[PDB]
Paper text:
Many invasive bacteria block the initial mucosal host response during colonization by cleaving host immunoglobulin A1 (IgA1) via a bacterially encoded IgA1 protease (IgA1P). Here, we used cryo-EM to characterize the metallo-IgA1P of a more distantly related family member from Gemella haemolysans, an emerging opportunistic pathogen implicated in meningitis, endocarditis, and more recently bacteremia in the elderly. Third, all M26 metallo-IgA1Ps comprise the M26 region itself that is responsible for IgA1 cleavage, which corresponds to G. haemolysans IgA1P residues 907-2201. The two histidine residues of the HEXXH motif together with a conserved downstream glutamic acid coordinate a Zn ion to polarize the carbonyl group of the substrate’s scissile peptide.
The catalytically impaired mutant of G. haemolysans IgA1P-E1848A was used to trap the enzyme in complex with the substrate IgA1 to compare its structure to the analogous S. pneumoniae IgA1P-E1605A/IgA1 complex previously determined. Our purification of the G. haemolysans IgA1P-E1848A mutant bound to monomeric IgA1 resulted in a highly pure complex amenable to cryo-EM analysis. A cryo-EM single particle reconstruction yielded a 3.5 Å resolution map that facilitated model building. Only one of the IgA1-FAB fragments is visible, as only one of the two hinge regions within the intact IgA1 is cleaved at a time, as steric hinderance prevents a second IgA1P from binding the other IgA1 hinge. Although most domains within the G. haemolysans IgA1P bound state did not incur large changes relative to the substrate-free structure, the NTD2 does undergo a conformational change. Specifically, the NTD2 repositions 4 Å relative to its free form. Thus, while the substrate-free G. haemolysans IgA1P NTD2 is already 6 Å lower than it is within the substrate-free S. pneumoniae IgA1P, it still must undergo a further opening to facilitate IgA1 substrate binding. Specifically, the conformational changes in NTD2 by the gating mechanism in both metallo-IgA1P complexes results in similar conformations within their bound states that is in contrast to larger differences observed of the NTD2 within their substrate-free states. Arguably, the most important similarity between the two bound metallo-IgA1P complexes is that the bound IgA1 hinge region and the conserved HEMTH along with the downstream glutamic acid motif are in similar positions. Interestingly, both metallo-IgA1Ps have similar stretches of missing density within these loops that comprise G. haemolysans IgA1P residues 1298-1307 and S. pneumoniae IgA1P residues 1054-1063.
Author numbering:
A (entry chain P): 1663 to 2201
B (entry chain B), C (entry chain A): 242 to 450
Amino acid sequence: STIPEVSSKQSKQGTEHSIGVYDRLTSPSWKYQSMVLPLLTLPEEKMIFMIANISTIGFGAYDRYRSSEYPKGDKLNRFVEENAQAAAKRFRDHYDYWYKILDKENKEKLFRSVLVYDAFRFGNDTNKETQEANFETNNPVIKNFFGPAGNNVVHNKHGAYATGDAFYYMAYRMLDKSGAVTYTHAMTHNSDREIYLGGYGRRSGLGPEFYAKGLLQAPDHSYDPTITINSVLKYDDSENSTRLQIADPTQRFTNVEDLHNYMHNMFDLIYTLEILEGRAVAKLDYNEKNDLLRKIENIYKKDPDGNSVYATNAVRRLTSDEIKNLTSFDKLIENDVITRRGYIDQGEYERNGYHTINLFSPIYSALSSKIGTPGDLMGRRMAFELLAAKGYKEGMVPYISNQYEKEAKDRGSKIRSYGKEIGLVTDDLVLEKVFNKKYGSWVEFKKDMYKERVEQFSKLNRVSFFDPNGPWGRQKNVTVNNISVLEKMIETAVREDAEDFTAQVYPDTNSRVLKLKKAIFKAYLDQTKDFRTSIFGGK
Amino acid sequence: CHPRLSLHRPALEDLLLGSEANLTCTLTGLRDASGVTFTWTPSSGKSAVQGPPERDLCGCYSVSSVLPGCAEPWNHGKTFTCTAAYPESKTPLTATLSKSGNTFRPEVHLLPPPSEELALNELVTLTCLARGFSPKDVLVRWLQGSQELPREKYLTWASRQEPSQGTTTFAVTSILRVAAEDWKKGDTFSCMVGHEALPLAFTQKTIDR
Amino acid sequence: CHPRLSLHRPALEDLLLGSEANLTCTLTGLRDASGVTFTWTPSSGKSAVQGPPERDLCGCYSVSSVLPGCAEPWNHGKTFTCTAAYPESKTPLTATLSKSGNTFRPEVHLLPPPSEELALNELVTLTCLARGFSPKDVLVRWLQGSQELPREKYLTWASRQEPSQGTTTFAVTSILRVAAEDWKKGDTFSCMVGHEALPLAFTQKTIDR
């Protein structure tokens, strides 16, 4: 690892700290230590490659990556060496970032040993067909190593799945970038209760996929306009344009306070953008306001238990009384309105679903469940907002860790699930805990955040920017100095967006407001070297 | 085609000159047959007339409804809400129409032709100015004496937002071309303007040499 | 969606004020991504740039091209023909643009506000007339002394067919609001009118009390 301290801890042979493959395989707590002999008596030809890490051990066959136009030989060897080294460095960078972030002395639990596999789908020299293996094929790789290392994989149709103590690539491939992204997702699945959270388990209602895709995972691309932290992979190859993310994860983050400051300032920008969009939306006709906004509801469907606590977020078309009540910006938070731009769905966002959160789509709703499950989209949004307001250790983790479950159970809220009694922690309880007495209800907390952001950009804002995004006519200079011009442009863009919203196929990426928001975000992210402080200067 | 339901205000000629106003709730993007319903919340003694499907952009069928005799309900102040159900999706799309408040009485300013145009005396560029009105629906036409000139005989621009502070009024200008001898002869030319904001709904500005 | 290709002239500001004209070749109805080839027949010292795709109605993906520095070829008289080949059909569509013949010099007639409007003296509504030009591309502004007023401070109409015999000319009108004090004091008002047919490309009409 990059940090000299863990490098010193790893260079020594000392168990529970050594990076050495042999020390890990020999020592207990390794599921299949039967690999040690076949991995030592392989026939001389190079068949398999191993990628080690501070927390994981990688296994893969050369035949996995062999292809039609890509046959065996020296070129296969060179490609495999280069990408194995690159993937090992990326994995090391990801776990170095996590080691920096964890400071509750839970970082000492990162020295575990977990194995990952490739897909056993070896390619041929003639055609790009990765035929499977079933411990009986004649490929020497499974004859020599994978066979004797006895463990069967279910061979799922698609998707690299985690088990709980191990992992196996199924559809992706560990050398590529998507390999690293799915690797971060996989380790979020595998190290969730003990490592990423401070020994506290998952929230009583939320499933394993809640923590996987929406948060605690690297963005699927650099394009992705989603609130997430680029943790594993770095890139500066013509990707500077439309980055919308962090270029250097191993350099941007040093400790918890840096991550908290970065998230806080990104939310400082996003709150200003949301405030401008909401102010524009408030002064609108009935039909446009109806077609441009929705409402989010909590539906307590019947659980796979005797309980009904677990809530499911559902988005429904809002009614006439609500839209009549929406006379100004501040009422938007009151009536729990969500924009249609990125959340077009009119059904339900089912629990345990791969739901992300859009960056430029405002969610004015401070909705929280009076029962102890907040749902998926509201869950992720509130978790990120809390991470912005308060650090990683207090906030976010208390929001979703069952950390207060013991105190909630002490206060009451007893419940029985899967034949055993267990405590139940509720949104109001965590709100009272993380903020001792500062906020009475979540609506007040959201309003206070918006208000403080309002005076914050009232006092300060940066001077020079070039985010024109006009017509095909050459327009380059806008030099937004006071946010009044930004608000005027946002309002004009919203009024324009009130039309041309009757598209069968493409009603979203043709929206002017999304492009303007993206331009503003990119200009502000590039102007500051790191994210640093968004609104700086004056006025 | 994803359908959407919209409402259109009645023509100002129907609103003013027409005894019974027809108000329309058209539906576009219907990618199926005419298995649709057109429901009007204010049932002020009117029936929803349904027509045959019409091919919209890329050939999508479009079905429309008409609520005739809407002048009295409009005079009654009742706002219209139109709800429709279509076979493609269960959810019913809704559109709402309401009275446009804060209307402004237009002002008419007849513009005599300039001296340079009058100096040529080949033709006179008779011009009229309609200004100071909130709604965008204004009927403008040129009147010669007591005889209304045909629409092809004069030229007029569409209404647009005018530069103003606070009040969002609109302006309209019209141009008429006729022989210079008629103006000098003594026969005057009139600018006849109609707008629903005025209780009389009409204003005339006339001048001659 | 049916593919459709067309050519568009550079903006009149680019045509007259702009040193390098940017002429547009746009394609609509392409049911796929930007796997298209755009070729200009008069590609004399110019580079074709294809930018982001613009999604039109009904999901028909559309992309366009820009030809910078076309002012000299436009002054050279070389017609611009654009050929587009798209993955949907092997046959490449072709679009042709040629110089607009029979250009007519506009006349600018500054109309003082009417006496009735001047009688109120609260605000005088200056009127500018742009008439008599075959091409439909005319730029009009209002000039206050030596300072040009912002476009948001005045309203101007668009080109439209006018009733004329033989020659197909167009007429545009511009309007402006200002107090009578400046008109009475001596501060004159200028109407800045530009058109490509004029060799000087600009005609100014100014008057005051």
